[PDB]
Write a protein that binds this ligand. Structure first.
Ligand SMILES: Nc1ncnc2c1ncn2[C@@H]1O[C@H](COP(=O)(O)OP(=O)(O)OP(=O)(O)O)[C@@H](O)[C@H]1O
Ligand SMILES: Nc1ncnc2c1ncn2[C@@H]1O[C@H](COP(=O)(O)OP(=O)(O)OP(=O)(O)O)[C@@H](O)[C@H]1O
Ligand SMILES: [Mg+2]
Ligand SMILES: [Mg+2]
Lengths: 485, 438, 106
DNA sequence: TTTGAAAAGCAAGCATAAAAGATCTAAACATAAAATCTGTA
């Protein structure tokens, strides 16, 4: 039979379709699910990235600082920790179902605090003072489909693999109908909650409505990026079910950021290493070299990061970048390779803070060819003349031609005009566009300096500056020929 | 080490093709563009180059036959696999299906799987994939050519099969969209009239001297026949170069249409005399000759539609009114001035149905119980419905049209040369209605 | 020298070494012997032919490929478009301008 | 036979209706692998 089209790359997973409501013939037929060999959590890829180390790498004096300042390795979050821990501990011990809403800006320790809470709760459950529970982590930005959370959570509960709809009625049956004595408490971290927001808002309603069921024993800890998300994007039902209590994670102050960086720099700052002068490898306790990172540098970086974001990721990255600048200068000075006091100074911290601030756009426009600068000058002249933010390309052509033909008496124009309109050549006729006109137009379009509308007539097509006008003016009058005229 | 063939007026292009296309993948660009307008000899020069170098492995694709991007990808996979099967028949291969390529990523995967099973070859080779007419794709966007530019970077570097792309383009502006990629481009400018005439003579005199009408004519009534065919081609060129431009195809069509009529006027006096033969058949050189029932109600409704579209409603009562007034009242005065611009040159205006029926009743050809004016019965509306179905008249909307809405307006959809011949078939004086307005 | 002139021209127009390489490659590849290569690299006469070919299909070269009737129709459409407010025209107005222009020539 | 004067005409101004189309979205039409059902052996 001849097909009208073919699907030759269909990949379908082995997911059954029958939900949990039809496993057993009755409510009384369900056993205690905590004793089943597949329920409640009862990797093979870690050896694939193993190789044979046949070299000896050199770890220098600043290597331990850069490795230790990473995000992989709880001082300033102790009230939020106490709130989340006490609510979750009361919900576990009473066999209740509870929503905990946590919101905040990036890098302020939300995921870290919730993970530390569930580690202390699992340790407390290991001492047999609260009942045992299953911890499920669902990240909305780590899902392909938003409904895959239905796939994930049920797979964490039962060990079955079903399609998302059947998983959704399975979770509904499990949370409402199964009694508490046959169940185990489940703590779910929903992280990046906004990523799980759809048009129907069914996932939001289901996940927060299961926390209103008497038999559920479900604790949902939802992490948001804003506090006004349930009012702005969600309905009144979901906003009512989330609750009035909402824990806000403020951005870190510079005392808190300094405490975080000093906590990572305990045992390394004001310490001595044994450093080989032949290769460069350094050992924590041949020369005895003292390593310092100054507290004034850390406080400058902490104050800047705390005013801009209050982000622990940025504070740690600025400190690591300063140490890498110092370590690059160190390897340049001593000639070390990749096989008495060394200090991360305040100047490295200022360089790390200024390298994301130095405005390469003006430098890029300064280092362009004469035709691109002439294009930008003509466009700026038209914006000065007729006062419009969008200029037609034919007007730019005509005003470039006027700029060449009026200030001819400039010696540079007498040098450049034959190049511009004939490419320095007899037997090439005079050209309506300049040489490399489309080249510099496409080059300024690639950089994001220009916006061009989508028209097929090249003369009436409009061009707008996407960058600010003042930086284009200062780049243009940096040029000695264009500022002369 | 490559052979440069002789093409009559494409010597620079053939030298550039010798510079860029070689069997060594190190000194060959990944992408090469041949840009020129239609009938500039891009395909001819590429065929003569690849025929004179038989050791070069070329695959030819016409994107015009593929129309969309997905059949282009599948055609690339199919044709590369078939050419590599034909080229090295003693290499065992898994036959990957072309129809499993639905993404450019899947083309990259399939080309990887095809090229990874030819590593037993001793030398690095080129495979020249020629997309003859890339911008002649019917569903083309601005983002498609970028994928083909960057395609070679996703294939392995140490492969024995290194695919090379040769592109043919027509329009300059499409090529100008990708100027910053710095792809090597050879341009084929349009010929002038002398090279067009030389190409036409050297490509068509052999076919003209052996055509059956001339062979029947010379027995009914080689070098001299070659001169006759060449003189005919030169006469066609000087008669119709202003009409055709420097188009080889249009002049070829004119030569085909006018050669047997030229042969039929050859006598024993005209054969050795070019001016006498030209005077016998001068009417073939004065006109290009490029060329190949409706109801009375529908004709008069078309005339009324044309009047409604190209005349203002305010001056209707000054033109069609003829009834004796029982009640006192002045009629329309008419227009004072004459228009500077002919309204028939511009777009037609939009009118209502009741105005069209009024003017149709005013212009339709003709006691106590007669009522000789024709009223709008079923047949008038039925002919109007056919008139819209044929789009001799049109509306503002064409899809899901509401015929009965008062907001829907109507316009005429025929030019003046059609409505003039229609009005000549019914002896209506339509030019009287436009002689005194502009 | 002619190389320094072409490099200066590239520096002032394209400022691109791939653009220069795309012209230098067929200068090297079209040489038959060493003396021809040295003459080519001194004169740089191939670079002018290359630059003429890279501009052969723009507006100027396409205008130079036009016939006399094609030029007449394009001129008539251009002056009708100049006299228009939005720059718009059609075939009818362009032909009217063409026939007035031919009658005023004849 | 004049007269003139209210009806008709023309152009500028400007608010607004509408044509064209850019962008999108639902609905019919279409295919397909895995699971589930089902009628016997
Ligand atoms: N109080 C803290 N003490 C120590 N390190 C911290 C602290 N807060 C944050 N960090 C560091 O910052 C990293 C990023 O923090 P975390 O992942 O908790 O951020 P987040 O607020 O969840 O951000 P996002 O919204 O981007 O997910 C942590 O992994 C850790 O390295
Ligand atoms: N230099 C030439 N010498 C001889 N014949 C030529 C030459 N150039 C073109 N022709 C003839 O004119 C025909 C049209 O040329 P060709 O098909 O190569 O044009 P093209 O530029 O590829 O066109 P298109 O873009 O329309 O496909 C050729 O098939 C050939 O018969
Ligand atoms: Mg987080
Ligand atoms: Mg062709």
């Amino acid at each position: 039979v001849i097909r009208k089209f073919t699907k030759k790359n269909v990949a379908r997973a082995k997911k059954k379709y029958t939900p949990f409501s039809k496993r057993f013939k009755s409510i009384a037929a369900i056993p205690d699910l905590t004793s089943l060999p597949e329920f409640y959590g009862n990797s093979r890829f870690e050896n694939k990235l193993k190789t044979t180390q046949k070299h000896q790498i050199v770890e220098t004096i600043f290597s331990k600082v850069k490795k230790q300042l990473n995000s992989s390795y709880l001082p300033a979050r102790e009230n939020e920790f106490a709130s989340i821990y006490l609510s979750a501990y009361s919900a576990i011990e009473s066999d209740s179902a509870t929503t905990i809403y946590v919101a905040g800006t990036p890098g302020v320790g939300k995921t870290l605090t919730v993970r530390e809470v569930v580690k202390e709760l699992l340790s407390s459950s290991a001492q047999r003072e609260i009942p045992d529970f299953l911890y499920v982590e669902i990240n909305g930005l780590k899902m392909v489909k938003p409904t895959d959370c239905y796939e994930t959570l049920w797979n964490k509960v039962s060990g079955e693999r079903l399609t998302w709809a059947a998983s959704m009625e399975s979770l509904e049956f499990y949370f409402k109908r199964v009694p508490k004595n046959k169940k185990k408490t489940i703590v779910v971290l929903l992280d990046e909650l906004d990523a799980m927001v759809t048009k129907s808002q069914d996932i939001m309603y289901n996940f927060f409505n299961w926390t209103t069921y008497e038999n559920a024993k479900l604790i949902v800890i939802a992490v948001a990026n804003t506090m006004d998300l349930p009012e702005r994007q969600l309905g009144n039902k979901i906003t009512s079910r989330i609750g009035f209590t909402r824990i806000m994670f403020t951005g870190y102050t510079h005392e808190e950021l300094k405490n975080i960086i000093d906590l990572r720099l305990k045992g390394l700052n004001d310490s001595f290493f044994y450093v080989d002068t032949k290769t460069g490898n350094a050992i924590l306790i041949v020369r005895k070299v003292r390593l310092r990172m100054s507290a004034d540098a850390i406080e400058i970086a902490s104050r800047k990061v705390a005013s801009v974001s209050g982000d622990a990721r940025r504070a740690l990255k600025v400190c690591k970048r300063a140490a890498e600048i110092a370590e690059k200068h160190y390897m340049a000075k001593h000639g070390y390779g990749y096989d008495g006091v060394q200090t991360v100074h305040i100047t490295h911290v200022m360089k790390a803070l200024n390298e994301t601030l130095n405005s390469h756009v003006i430098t890029f426009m300064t280092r362009l060819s004469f035709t691109a600068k002439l294009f930008i000058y003509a466009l700026l002249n038209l914006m000065k003349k007729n006062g419009s933010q969008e200029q037609e390309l034919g007007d730019i052509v005509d005003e470039i031609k006027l700029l060449i033909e009026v200030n001819g008496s400039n010696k540079f124009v007498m040098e450049i005009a034959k190049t511009l309109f004939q490419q320095g050549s007899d037997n090439i006729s005079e050209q309506l566009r300049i040489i490399s006109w489309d080249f510099v137009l496409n080059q300024l379009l690639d950089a994001g300096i220009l916006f061009k509308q989508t028209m097929k007539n090249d003369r009436i097509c409009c061009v707008k500056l996407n960058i600010s006008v003042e930086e284009a003016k200062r780049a243009m009058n940096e040029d000695e020929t264009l500022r002369n005229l | 080490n490559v052979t440069t063939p002789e093409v009559a007026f494409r010597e620079y292009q053939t030298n550039c093709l010798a510079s860029y296309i070689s069997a060594d993948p190190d000194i060959t660009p990944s992408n090469l563009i041949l840009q020129g307008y239609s009938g500039t000899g891009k395909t001819y020069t590429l065929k003569k180059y690849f025929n004179a170098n038989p050791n070069l492995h070329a695959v030819w694709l016409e994107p015009v036959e593929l129309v969309s991007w997905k059949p282009l990808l599948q055609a690339i996979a199919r044709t590369v696999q078939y050419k590599l099967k034909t080229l090295y028949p003693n290499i065992p291969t898994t036959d990957y299906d072309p129809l499993q390529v639905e993404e450019p990523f899947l083309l990259v995967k399939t080309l990887h799987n095809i090229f990874v099973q030819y590593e037993s070859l001793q030398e690095k080779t080129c495979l020249f994939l020629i997309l003859d007419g890339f911008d002649s794709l019917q569903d083309l966007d601005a983002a498609l050519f970028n994928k083909y530019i960057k395609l070679n970077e996703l294939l392995p570097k140490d492969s024995k099969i290194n695919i090379k792309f040769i592109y043919t383009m027509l329009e300059t502006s499409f090529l100008q969209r990708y100027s910053t990629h710095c792809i090597p481009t050879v341009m084929f400018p349009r010929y002038n009239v002398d090279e067009v005439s030389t190409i036409l003579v050297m490509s068509r005199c052999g076919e003209l001297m052996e055509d059956s009408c001339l062979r029947k004519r010379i027995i009914e009534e080689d070098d001299q026949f070659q001169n006759v065919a060449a003189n005919f081609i030169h006469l066609i060129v000087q008669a119709f170069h202003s009409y055709t431009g420097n188009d080889i195809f249009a002049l070829n069509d004119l030569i085909d249409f006018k050669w047997p009529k030229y042969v039929s006027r050859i006598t024993k006096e005209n054969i050795f005399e070019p001016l006498a033969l030209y005077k016998s058949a001068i009417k073939l050189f004065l006109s290009t000759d490029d060329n190949l029932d409706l109801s009375i109600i529908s004709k008069y409704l078309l005339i009324a539609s044309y009047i409604c579209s190209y005349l203002e409603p305010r001056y209707d009562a000054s033109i069609f009114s003829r009834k004796t007034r029982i009640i006192q009242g002045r009629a329309a005065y008419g227009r004072r001035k004459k228009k500077e611009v002919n309204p028939r040159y511009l777009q037609p205006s939009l009118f209502a149905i009741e105005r069209l029926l009024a003017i149709f009743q005013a212009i339709f050809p003709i006691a106590l119980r007669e009522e000789s004016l024709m009223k709008a019965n079923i047949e008038v509306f039925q002919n109007l419905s056919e008139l819209h179905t044929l789009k001799l008249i049109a509306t503002t909307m064409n899809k899901n049209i509401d015929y009965l809405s008062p907001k829907v307006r109507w316009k005429v959809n025929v030019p003046w040369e059609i409505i003039k011949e229609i009005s000549e078939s019914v002896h209506f004086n339509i030019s009287d209605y436009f002689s005194d307005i502009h | 020298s002619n190389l320094n002139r072409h490099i200066r021209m590239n520096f002032e127009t394209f400022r691109s070494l791939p653009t220069l390489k795309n012209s230098i490659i067929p200068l090297v590849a079209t040489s038959k012997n060493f003396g021809s290569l040295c003459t080519a690299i001194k004169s740089c006469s191939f670079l002018d032919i290359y630059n003429k070919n890279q501009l052969s299909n723009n507006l100027t070269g396409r205008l130079q490929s036009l016939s006399d009737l094609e030029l007449a129709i394009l001129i008539s459409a251009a002056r009708v478009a100049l006299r228009a407010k939005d720059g718009s025209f059609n075939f009818n107005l362009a032909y009217a301008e063409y026939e007035k222009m031919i009658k005023a020539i004849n």
